Symmetry: D2
Subunit: 251 residues, 4 copies
Amino acid sequence: EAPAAVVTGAAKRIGRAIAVKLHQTGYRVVIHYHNSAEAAVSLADELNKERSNTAVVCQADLTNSNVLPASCEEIINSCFRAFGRCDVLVNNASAFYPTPLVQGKTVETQVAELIGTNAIAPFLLTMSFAQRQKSNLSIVNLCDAMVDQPCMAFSLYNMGKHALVGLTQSAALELAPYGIRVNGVAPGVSLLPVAMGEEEKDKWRRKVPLGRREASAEQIADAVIFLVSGSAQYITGSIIKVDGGLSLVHA
Amino acid sequence: EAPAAVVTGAAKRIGRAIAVKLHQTGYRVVIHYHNSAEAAVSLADELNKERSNTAVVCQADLTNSNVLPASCEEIINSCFRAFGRCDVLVNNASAFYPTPLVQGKTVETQVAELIGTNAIAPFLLTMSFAQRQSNLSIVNLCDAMVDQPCMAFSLYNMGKHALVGLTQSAALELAPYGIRVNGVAPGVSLLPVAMGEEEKDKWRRKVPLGRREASAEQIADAVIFLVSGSAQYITGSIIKVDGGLSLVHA
Amino acid sequence: EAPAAVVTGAAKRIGRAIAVKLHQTGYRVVIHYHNSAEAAVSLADELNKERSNTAVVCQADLTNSNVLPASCEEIINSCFRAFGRCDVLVNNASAFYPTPLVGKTVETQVAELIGTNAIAPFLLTMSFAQRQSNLSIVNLCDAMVDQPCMAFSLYNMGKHALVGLTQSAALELAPYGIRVNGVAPGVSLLPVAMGEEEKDKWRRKVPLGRREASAEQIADAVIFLVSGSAQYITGSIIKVDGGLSLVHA
Amino acid sequence: EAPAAVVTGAAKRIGRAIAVKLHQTGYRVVIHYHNSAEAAVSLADELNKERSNTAVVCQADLTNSNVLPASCEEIINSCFRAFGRCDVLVNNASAFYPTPLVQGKTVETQVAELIGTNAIAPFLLTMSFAQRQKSNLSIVNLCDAMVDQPCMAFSLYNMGKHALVGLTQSAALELAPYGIRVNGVAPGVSLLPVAMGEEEKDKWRRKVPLGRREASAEQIADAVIFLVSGSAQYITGSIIKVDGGLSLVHA
Ligand SMILES: NC(=O)C1=CN([C@@H]2O[C@H](COP(=O)(O)OP(=O)(O)OC[C@H]3O[C@@H](n4cnc5c(N)ncnc54)[C@H](OP(=O)(O)O)[C@@H]3O)[C@@H](O)[C@H]2O)C=CC1
Ligand SMILES: NC(=O)C1=CN([C@@H]2O[C@H](COP(=O)(O)OP(=O)(O)OC[C@H]3O[C@@H](n4cnc5c(N)ncnc54)[C@H](OP(=O)(O)O)[C@@H]3O)[C@@H](O)[C@H]2O)C=CC1
Ligand SMILES: NC(=O)C1=CN([C@@H]2O[C@H](COP(=O)(O)OP(=O)(O)OC[C@H]3O[C@@H](n4cnc5c(N)ncnc54)[C@H](OP(=O)(O)O)[C@@H]3O)[C@@H](O)[C@H]2O)C=CC1
Ligand SMILES: NC(=O)C1=CN([C@@H]2O[C@H](COP(=O)(O)OP(=O)(O)OC[C@H]3O[C@@H](n4cnc5c(N)ncnc54)[C@H](OP(=O)(O)O)[C@@H]3O)[C@@H](O)[C@H]2O)C=CC1
Ligand SMILES: N=C(N)Nc1nc2cc(Cl)c(Cl)cc2[nH]1
Ligand SMILES: N=C(N)Nc1nc2cc(Cl)c(Cl)cc2[nH]1
Ligand SMILES: N=C(N)Nc1nc2cc(Cl)c(Cl)cc2[nH]1
Ligand SMILES: N=C(N)Nc1nc2cc(Cl)c(Cl)cc2[nH]1
C-alpha cells in the first residue's frame, strides 16, 4: 500500500528532516548512511516505533571509484528488498570542504569524494532507480543556491553541484516518458557546518535578507515534500531555491 | 478572521483557478478583471454562495498610462475596503500577442498594453501592496520559455523578463518587512482561445511529461505552495511549472 | 563606403568611449544626446577633425511617451541622412536612479527608467531593422541585474527587459543577417554624484584588480561584437565585470 | 618573450583551429593529443616551418584515474620545458557520446571518460597552471551553449560541461588575485561529429537562425583569441556563446 523512499545521508541534519517528513507523509524509508551508524539506527528506531516495519538503514560509501555503480545499485536494491518498491529517490548525501587551486587528503581523494557524492553517485542512483521502473515516481536532488556566487577555494564542490544541476535537467528530459519526475531543492544557508565557530555562523546567518536566519532542516524538507507530492505532478527539471533571498545580495 | 488575497485577471483560466484555490484554502478574494465582467461577477457570486461576502470584484485597465498608478492603488484599496487587510497579491493578468520588429494597434498601444500588464502594473501593485503594510507574499506569473521565445513576441518577452527583475528586486527590498516575493513560470498551460486546434496540438505534443499542457489547477497548485506556510523561507524564487518543455532543444 | 553607427547617449562616459572606438575602427558615427549638447558637439568636432565628414550629432529625449516611436525613427533617419546607411546600433543611453517601493512622479520614473533602458532600445531596433554587410546591434546591459542594488526596481526591470529584447530580436532579425548582442558592465565609470569613499567601497569589491572598468574596456567588448571576429555570435551578452558578479554577500 | 599556450585536444577540429590562431597571433603552442599522433606532429611541423621552435606535442589520456593529476602536471610542465613559460591554457579536449540512464564501455569507463575530459582534467590542469604562477595570463574553457536544452541520453556529458561552468566561475574568483583571467567559449553546433550522416548534419544546420549553418572552427577560435587578448583585460568568469542563436530556438 504505502510508497517507499530512499534518502541518502539521512542520519542527521537535512537528510534526517527529509526522511522524517516523508515518513510522516506515509512513506516507508531507506535511511542511507556512511559513517553515522548509531544515528541512522536511532532514527530507524523512532520511525518503526511510530509504524511497524516502515524504516530500514543501508550503509554505503558514495566516494567515486570503480565499485561506486555496484554500491548505488545496492542502495536501490535494499529498498526493493525491504518494501518491494521504490517510488522516491532523494539525493541528499554530500561532501563539503575547500580544495584550493594554489597550495590530509590527496587531490585524487578530493576529486573522488566531492565529485562522487555530489554528482556521480546521484547519477548512478538515478540509473539504478530508473532501471527498476523500466504511481507518483520522482527524484529530488539537493542542489545549492549559491553556486554562481561561490565560496573561495570550493572549486571541486562547486563543480559537483553544477554537475548535479546538469543531471537534474538531463534526467528530467530522459525520464519524463516513464512518468518519473526529476527536480531539485537548492538551500542557501541552512544548518551550518558542525566545525564552524559560533562567530562565523552568526556572520553567515546575518547575510540572509529574510529574517537574518538560516533555513531550518524542516524548511528544506518542506520543499522536498512539495516536489514529491501530487501538488507538483507537472513539475520536472525545476530547481526550487530555498535561500531567504541570500543569492540576491550583491558583494 | 481570515486572510485576504488580490488576484489580477482572475475571471477565467489560470487566474480563476488561483482565486478558487485560495478561496478553498480559506482566503477572502478580490477578483480583478478588465473586459470579462460576466465571468468575474459570476465567479464572485459562486464563491459568496460558498461563504457569504468572501469575494468582491474590481475592474481596471492595466494598460500603461498616466492613470495606471491610481487604478493599481484602487485595486489594493478594494481589498482593504472589503476585508480590512491584504495578505497576498497575485499578479496574473497579462496581455499576449505578436509585435513584429519588421512591418491594427499602433506600436504605442502595443507598448502600453504588453509592458503595462506584464510589468508596470505588477510594479505599481507591489508598491501599493507594500505601502499599506503575518504571512504576507506576492506571486508573479512568469513564463518558463522567456529564454527561448516565440518569434515576433519581443514586447511580450520584454515584459516577462521585466517581471523576473521585479520579483528579485522586490524580494530583496521587501524581505525586512517579512513580505516574500516569488514567481511561477508556466510553460504551456491553457492555450490562447484564438490559437487554432492544430497549433494547440503542436504545443502540447512538445511537452516531455505527458505530451499535455498544464491544467489551470496545476499552476494554481504551485501558487498555493508559495503562499503557504510550507514556503516561509522562500523569496526571490521562480518555480517553473512546465512539464520539462524548456529543456527541449530546437 | 565607410560603414556608419548610431550610439545613443554618446556625449559622455562609456558611450563617448564607444563612439570614439568605433570611429578609430573606421565608422562614421551619429552621436545621440539628450541634455549634453556642448559635450556632444565637442566630440563631433574632435572626430571630424580626424576625418572630415564622419561625425554628426542628434538630439532626442528617450523618455517613454506616445511620440517615442517617432523620435526613435528620427534617430535612425539621421544616420541615413548623414551617411546614406546604418550598419550598427549601440543602445547605450540609460537613466539610473533609485525608485523605492515604500520630485519625480512615479509615472515619470516609469517613463524614464523603462523608456530609456528598454522601450527606446526596442523602437530603435524596429527602425533599424525596417531600413534593412556586417549589420549588428549592441545593447548595454548590466552584470549585476540578478543581485540588484536595494531600491532600484524600475531600473532593474528595464535592464532585464533589455536582455529579453536582446534574445527576441536576435532570434527574429537573424534571417536578415542582423546580429543582436549585449555587453554587461559591472562597476565601470562611477556615478558623477558619488563620494570618493563610496567609490572606494565599490572598487574593493572587484576581484580582478580591485578597480572599476574603464570606459575603453567596455568599448573593447562592443568593438568585438560588431567586428568580423564575432560573425557567428548573436543573442550573446558578454559580462565585463572583473568577476564582481561572482562575489557573494 | 613570445608567450606560450597549452591547448588540449589540439590535433584536429576546433582545438587545431585554436592552436593555429594562437600561433598566428604570436604564441608558442603545446599541442596536446591523445590518439591522433599523426595529426599532432603534422600540425607541429607546419607551425615550426612558419617559425622555428614554436610548437611541440604532448600526448596524454585525460580519462579520470588516480594517475590523472600527474599527467596534468606533466602537460603544463611540457610548456615550461619547451618554452620556459606558460601564459594561456585552453581546455578544449572533450569526450562526447550518449550514456542512456536505462539499458560497449562499462558505466565506470563512461564516467571516467566523460567527467575526466570535460571537468576533472580541466580542474587539475588549472591547479597546475596556477601553481606555476603563485603579463597576460588566462584560461579559456570550451563549454557548450546547449547545456540547458540537452540532447536526449547525454547525461554524463552534460554533467561534465555544467561542472566546467562551475570551474570557470570558481577559478575566476580564486585566481583573480594572481591576475589570471578564467573565461569560457560555448559553441552551439560547430564541426559535426565525424560519424554523423549528411542527412542528420543538415537537420542540425537547419535549426540555426543565423545563416542555417554550423560555426566553422575558425569562428570558435575567434572568440578564444578575443578572450586571451588585451581587449579582454577586465573580463573574467564570463562565457561567450558562439552559437548563431541556436540556444534561443524553442522546441
Ligand atoms: N547545510 C547547508 O547549509 C546547505 C546544504 N546544501 C545541500 O543540502 C544537502 C544536505 O545538507 P547537510 O544536511 O548540511 O549535509 P551534510 O554535510 O550534513 O551531509 C549529509 C550526509 O552526507 C553523507 N555523506 C558525506 N560524504 C559521504 C560519502 N563519501 N559517502 C556517503 N555519504 C556521505 C554523510 O553521511 P554520514 O554522516 O552517515 O557519514 C552526512 O551525514 C547537501 O546535498 C548539501 O550540499 C546546500 C546548501 C547549503
Ligand atoms: N496560458 C499559458 O499557456 C501560459 C500562461 N503564462 C502566464 O500565466 C498567467 C495567466 O495565464 P492565462 O490564464 O493564459 O492568461 P490570459 O491570457 O487568460 O490573461 C489573464 C487575464 O489578463 C487580463 N488582461 C489582459 N489584458 C489586460 C489589460 N489591459 N488590463 C487588465 N487586465 C488585462 C484579462 O482580463 P479580462 O478577461 O477580464 O479582460 C485576462 O482574463 C499570465 O501571466 C501568463 O502570461 C505563461 C506561460 C504560458
Ligand atoms: N557606469 C557604470 O558603472 C555601469 C554602466 N552600465 C550601463 O552602461 C551604459 C553606459 O553607462 P554610463 O556611461 O555610466 O551612462 P550614463 O548614466 O552616464 O548615461 C549615458 C547617457 O544616457 C543619456 N540619457 C539619460 N536619460 C536620457 C533620456 N531620457 N533620453 C535620452 N538620453 C538619455 C544621457 O545623455 P545626456 O547627457 O546627453 O542627457 C547620458 O549622458 C548604460 O546603459 C548603463 O546602464 C551598466 C552597469 C554599470
Ligand atoms: N563540435 C561542436 O559542434 C561542439 C563543440 N563543443 C566543444 O568544443 C570543444 C572542441 O570540440 P570538437 O573539436 O568537436 O572536439 P572533438 O570531439 O573533436 O574532440 C577534441 C579532442 O578531444 C580529445 N580527447 C577526447 N577524449 C580524450 C581523452 N580521454 N583524453 C585526452 N584527450 C581526449 C581528442 O584528441 P585525439 O583526437 O588526439 O584522441 C579529440 O581530438 C569540446 O570541448 C566540445 O565539447 C561544444 C559544443 C558543440
Ligand atoms: N554541508 C553540505 N554538504 N553542503 C553545504 N553546506 C553549506 C554551507 C554554506 Cl554556508 C553554503 Cl553557502 C553552502 C553549503 N553547502
Ligand atoms: N496567455 C498569456 N497571457 N500568456 C501566455 N500564453 C502563452 C502561451 C504559450 Cl504557447 C506560451 Cl509558450 C507562452 C504564453 N504566455
Ligand atoms: N549610469 C547608468 N546609466 N547605469 C549604471 N550605472 C551604474 C553604476 C553602478 Cl555602481 C552599477 Cl552596480 C550599475 C550601474 N548602472
Ligand atoms: N564533440 C565534443 N567533444 N563535444 C560536442 N560536440 C557536439 C556537437 C553538437 Cl551538434 C552539440 Cl549540440 C554539442 C556537442 N558537443
